[PDB]
Amino acid sequence: NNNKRWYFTREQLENSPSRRFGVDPDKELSYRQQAANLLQDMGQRLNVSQLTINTAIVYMHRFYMIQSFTQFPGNSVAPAALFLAAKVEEQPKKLEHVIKVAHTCLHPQESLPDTRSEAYLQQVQDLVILESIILQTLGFELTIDHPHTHVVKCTQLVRASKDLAQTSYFMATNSLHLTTFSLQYTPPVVACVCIHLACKWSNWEIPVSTDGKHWWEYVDATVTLELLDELTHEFLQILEKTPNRLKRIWNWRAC
Amino acid sequence: VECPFCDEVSKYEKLAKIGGEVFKARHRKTGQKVALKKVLMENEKEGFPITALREIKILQLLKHENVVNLIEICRTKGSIYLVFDFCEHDLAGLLSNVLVKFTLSEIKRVMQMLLNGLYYIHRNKILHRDMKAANVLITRDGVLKLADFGLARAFSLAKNSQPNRYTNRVVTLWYRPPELLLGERDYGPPIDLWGAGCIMAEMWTRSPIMQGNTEQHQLALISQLCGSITPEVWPNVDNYELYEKLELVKGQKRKVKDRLKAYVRDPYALDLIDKLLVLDPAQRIDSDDALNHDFFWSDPMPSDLKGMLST
Amino acid sequence: MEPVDPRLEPWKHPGSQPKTACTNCYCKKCCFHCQVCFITKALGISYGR
Amino acid sequence: LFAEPYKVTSKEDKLSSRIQSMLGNYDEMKDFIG
RNA sequence: GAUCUGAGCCUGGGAGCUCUC
Ligand SMILES: [Zn+2]
Ligand SMILES: [Zn+2]
């Protein structure tokens, strides 16, 4: 039963480790989104493949399924997580480079500590130690599958246009930054939700195969229209809980 | 400090030393025999060694009847320990013992399982990059097992574009293929078989056919046995930045079968070894075609090793 | 933002860093400049210092 | 095996409209995503 | 003024603003 390990239910998520130390549901998810944002930011500054970022995000979601934000800050686990994902995704980044970039994002004010200072040497240990903790907490199960993998394969098969392909893959990334489907549903299923969510927003409709079978049936044998609509409902419901403008940006204002 | 997914090494009882890196312990409760491999975190310059991550990440993937099985990973109340299914013997040790006798039939079985193991790891897109009688284990029931995947990783099938740039300094000098000694970074599976060919030769010589002290010395020995490295037998071999910068004999001819004649004896056996010790990796026979060689389908036919293990 | 062929190896995948420097505008065009901009501008999710 | 996707005449899907009134008009936010 | 004695929120990201003192 290694599969059902990193796959919980709505109830289990409602009783996360952080929820044990008094952390509102909507509050915890917030930390997750922030943690994902940090990973995405540092990743781009380190010029690492999106794969490394997504992989790092997955570890984050799973890491807090055993640990709590109260004990492990999101701004601390992110650096270690990304540093680990880099190696796993055959794209390692010097520990010095990671700490340097992480400090530029977490401390835009203060100046980058000297590579000789006592403070710097400390951050190194903290990151290295935390790294070992993440590995143990995850059971050394680095191998991670992302929806993006299934999204691309589907788009090419259905002969979807670029604009539609870009959006589908785009939503696949937002799911790891806003939602926690990576801990509820398998990548294949999540991939369908993204495409289905992109189609409804793009007005594009994927016809039925020449064999009389829906598109999602070629991505997963457990996916159904009833599921997609239900999942798409939750995805959007989480999007509506966003604290910023998504209605005011509907213009062609200057810069 | 929570940690349910990482039992303490205390659950095992160390017995003896192997390979203070590898030890032979037994489960305090079940009594099961296992092999404890301590992670060498001597170079804490880049945190947990990437070499370990790969081995662990690969072992959790590879699961063949001819590949070592990774039970779990323990810790210390810290250091990391990799648990494997203990192996009574090891090809290296057996060949060292004179009391041990290998019949033409048993020998074919050893290589059959060896190549069969390589086929798996290679099919799964993985390179051992460290083939040697030392890493060739053999269970108590006479079942070959490929172990020690430290220097092992995953390669790519080059999408007909910009080649790869893997690590050059890999595989034991004695079991290191020519390409690697010339500065080849875009190698592949062929590097593993070269070691297999050298290992199959030890099945009769009971000792490394090519024992070089240096990288250049190794090439010299390979050139005196496999023959001189020339563009004729090795097309585009001159492109190597080390081809001309390294003085390589030109008169030496191929004498693989001639040297291993008094040892191997068997015709087919010699033929296979000759195809495995091919200079050019492009012409070097693969694991698949290696199993289809008459050597594995000619009297006497392969058989278990239990009979031999009795000594 | 931009799709990536899964068949490609980890060490082969392109960098996440956008071709153009992350502009500093809240316009409907910059809100989707990259993944960070969308999360920080469109969704307004920041980690703060 | 599959036919090249097409547009939908007036997305009547409650889910579609929900997104439109959330993220905005698709077509106008494509030349930016990726 | 803090700002792990807090934030709500929003215009071009604050160089905007008010909240329990
Ligand atoms: Zn702008
Ligand atoms: Zn940007």
Numbering used by the authors:
A (entry chain B): 7 to 261
B (entry chain A): 8 to 26, 31 to 88, 97 to 330
C (entry chain D): 1 to 49
D (entry chain C): 34 to 67
What does the paper say about this structure?
To clearly define the interactions between TAR and Tat:P-TEFb, and to determine if direct interactions existed between TAR and AFF4, we solved the crystal structure of the TAR:Tat:SEC complex at 5.9 Å resolution. The structure of TAR bound to Tat:AFF4:P-TEFb reveals extensive interactions between the TAR loop and a composite protein interaction site, composed of CycT1 TRM and the Tat Zn2+-coordination loop, Tat residues 24–29. TAR loop nucleotides G32 and G33 abut the Tat Zn2+ -coordination loop (24-29) and CycT TRM, residues 259-261. The backbone phosphates of nucleotides 30–32 contact basic residues in the CycT TRM region. The structure of the TAR complex with Tat:AFF4:P-TEFb shows no direct contacts between AFF4 and TAR. Instead, AFF4 helix α2 and its N-terminal loop connection to helix α1 are interacting with CycT1 TRM and Tat helix α1. The interaction network between these three protein regions most likely stabilizes the protein interaction surface for TAR and indirectly increases Tat:SEC affinity for TAR in the presence of AFF4. However, there is not interpretable electron density present for residues in the Tat ARM region at the limited resolution of this crystal structure. From there, the ARM (residues 49-57) extends into the major groove of TAR stretching from the TAR bulge towards the phosphate backbone opposite the bulge.
